[PDB]
């Protein structure tokens, strides 16, 4: 089983560890871990194109989008590969992450190893705001490069 | 990937940015950049197996060797700055000798034994 990990860091209190596991190349990727230092509530959660943290999260580029699709939520047909929706933080600022996604991969062209995972200031509206390429999730609070793990 | 980048950071003052470019699949990889905060002299320069920085550099695993990850030493001047310009044909940005998603580490001592891991970062896709 392929495994990966990402340590999210930023300029403030937001920090976390997110694990990834994929049992077969054609199968879903389990994403799990926690992010601390967040405001209680929803926070956008995305894989961005570049594993470039030379300017913090600012250099990560846009949402990872190898298929040139429109932004959406994870269960939407039309979505960026990197659209993992939202995570939810408790009253202590801790967001427990437990996602299973069949669009991201740890191999092939949907490959997220070496790219950047980012958690945002606000909720990602998933393109269902009722009135986007980002989901209006606000600033990039913390991020890290996704690496190969044991 | 044709280009990769790595931001090195640790618990102390060692910091830097290292670029990797491999314009041709399976071709030589150019590695360049600068690292500051080092003691004057030689410092081991290695790719470690895991891009796992959950425990800082201590979780990066062993030297990558499916040594494939051994990039020799970098040399810091009197100001603590090491300018890096290396060509390596064993590492790669694809394939079995894939270093994307692994950890680059600069060590306390020379890699003639290299001592502590002063700074490290996960190698990310840049282009
Ligand atoms: Zn984002
Ligand atoms: Zn998106
Ligand atoms: Zn080493």
């Amino acid at each position: 089983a392929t495994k990966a990990v990402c340590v999210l860091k930023g300029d403030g209190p937001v920090q976390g560890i997110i694990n990834f596991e994929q049992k077969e190349s054609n199968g879903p990727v389990k994403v799990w871990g926690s992010i601390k230092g967040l405001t209680e509530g929803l926070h956008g959660f995305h894989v961005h194109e570049f594993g470039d943290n030379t300017a913090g999260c600012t250099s990560a580029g846009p949402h990872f989008n190898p298929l040139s699709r429109k932004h959406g939520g994870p269960k939407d047909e039309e979505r960026h590969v990197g659209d993992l929706g939202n995570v939810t933080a408790d009253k202590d600022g801790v967001a427990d992450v437990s996602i299973e996604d069949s669009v991201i991969s740890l191999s092939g062209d949907h490959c997220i190893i070496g790219r950047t995972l980012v958690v945002h200031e606000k909720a990602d509206d998933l393109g269902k705001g009722g009135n986007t390429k980002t989901g209006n999730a606000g600033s990039r609070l913390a991020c890290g490069v996704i690496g190969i793990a044991q």
Side-chain angles (χ1 to χ4, degrees), chain A residues 1-130 132-150:
Chain A
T2 308
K3 293 187 180 169
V5 71
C6 184
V7 178
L8 299 158
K9 262 53 191 172
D11 295 330
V14 182
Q15 62 187 45
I17 295 173
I18 300 296
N19 307 279
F20 301 84
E21 177 171 342
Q22 190 180 27
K23 296 190 187 183
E24 54 214 273
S25 66
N26 49 292
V29 181
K30 204 320 175 47
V31 185
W32 79 103
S34 68
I35 307 167
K36 305 175 166 187
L38 294 165
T39 53
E40 179 176 6
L42 297 167
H43 296 272
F45 194 51
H46 313 128
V47 179
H48 287 242
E49 186 174 4
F50 306 115
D52 184 330
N53 287 181
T54 60
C57 304
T58 307
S59 41
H63 299 181
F64 180 46
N65 188 24
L67 299 176
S68 298
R69 303 285 174 266
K70 297 192 183 174
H71 179 71
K75 287 191 68 155
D76 290 307
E77 299 180 2
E78 184 73 2
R79 60 171 267 193
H80 297 144
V81 167
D83 289 343
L84 293 175
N86 293 288
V87 302
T88 305
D90 71 15
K91 69 178 183 173
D92 286 344
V94 181
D96 183 57
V97 182
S98 194
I99 294 179
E100 191 133 302
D101 195 78
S102 66
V103 176
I104 56 170
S105 191
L106 303 182
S107 63
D109 63 326
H110 288 200
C111 199
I112 61 173
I113 291 168
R115 307 195 186 269
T116 293
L117 186 64
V118 180
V119 63
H120 288 266
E121 166 199 8
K122 320 204 275 90
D124 181 340
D125 71 13
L126 314 188
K128 300 179 187 74
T132 198
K133 283 205 208 148
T134 65
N136 298 301
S139 72
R140 303 182 181 182
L141 296 186
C143 56
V145 180
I146 301 171
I148 296 168
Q150 185 174 195

